[PDB]
Amino acid sequence: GAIRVYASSTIGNYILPEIIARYRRDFPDLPLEMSVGNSLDVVQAVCDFRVDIGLIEGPCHMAEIVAQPWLEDELVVFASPASPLLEGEVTLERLAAMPWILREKGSGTREIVDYLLLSHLPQFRLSMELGNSEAIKHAVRHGLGVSCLSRRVIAEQLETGSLVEVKVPLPPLVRTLYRIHHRQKHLSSALARFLRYCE
Amino acid sequence: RNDNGAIRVYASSTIGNYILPEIIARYRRDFPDLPLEMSVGNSLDVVQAVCDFRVDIGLIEGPCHMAEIVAQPWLEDELVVFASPASPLLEGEVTLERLAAMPWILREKGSGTREIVDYLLLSHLPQFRLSMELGNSEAIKHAVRHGLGVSCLSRRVIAEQLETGSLVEVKVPLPPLVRTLYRIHHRQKHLSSALARFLRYCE
Description:
The structure is a homodimer.
Chain A: E1 3-8, H1 9-14, H2 16-26, E2 32-37, H3 39-47, E3 53-56, E4 65-79, H4 92-97, E5 99-103, H5 109-116, E6 125-130, H6 133-141, E7 147-150, H7 151-160, E8 164-165, E9 173-182, H8 189-197
Parallel strand pairs in A: 1-2, 1-3, 5-6
Antiparallel strand pairs in A: 3-9, 4-7, 4-8, 4-9
């Protein structure tokens, strides 16, 4: 059972590592390969049969590619504890006045935040875009601005207090993570075993 | 597509994620009016973008011997072996044989990290079991933190976890693995006042 997985950045780096550690405790000798990228990377790899399953953090439809809900996930606005955002009332207008550090388009996490969060921030200040969420976390920590990422990405820093979650006058920015596979490819027993660990 | 005339920096993965963010914060705080773009990849990605004149400045974590590239040493960087505090490896004396018996998680070839760990560390192991290869140090950091085997990364990558105790440095019976990080630009690059200034903020 040489399983090949392709996951988007939030899934690959901040969810799957724990899942993989457990899977390898009970199965240290079974080959496991995981690539991490963005949505189009994942879907194209499934479409090309170069991987067995894909895991994406935003819907990305492709004909002949089946997608099934897998996990809910909540995106969270966060800041340095010394941020000027926390010096006053967290209003929508003061939110848009802060410099925003966002992921690039095609990351999934960028698409959902556009929909649930930044669409309600008129003329919001875009400071920079960064290609990975780790650089974003540390840029916010050093005061370059604020951002919006899955809670699972920043939980470590929320617990230490190097980053702080912001209360936003909006409904929770909840999304769904999807599992995808080609319509033709058949689920292997080893593959179905690995997926149970992901639940 | 449009090019808005930002200062463009390309950095390899250790520098881009664990050194450059603070630099960018300080520079943006003092010069808010120039746009800034950073990209992160491997050292080859940086060198190609400098050679292509797609970026202004590069920062790499291996040497670049190219006549068209001016490379100035910038910082020393030490790579260390690490594991979770619950690792069997942390009890007793750490020997080459016991390291050989742990499952290893490594970065992919071309990462810089992989090349130097292969040369100075894994090459001294009589055997070693490759648990997984992973394309970024963040998935690695957290796999090891959740109890999967051991890995070798720049201390800067795991400094956060060393500080809190979720990862523990492992003393190994080999000389320390130290490399040099470089600032690079094209020999024909015009270093405008703004670019020369960003370079100084990298100190």
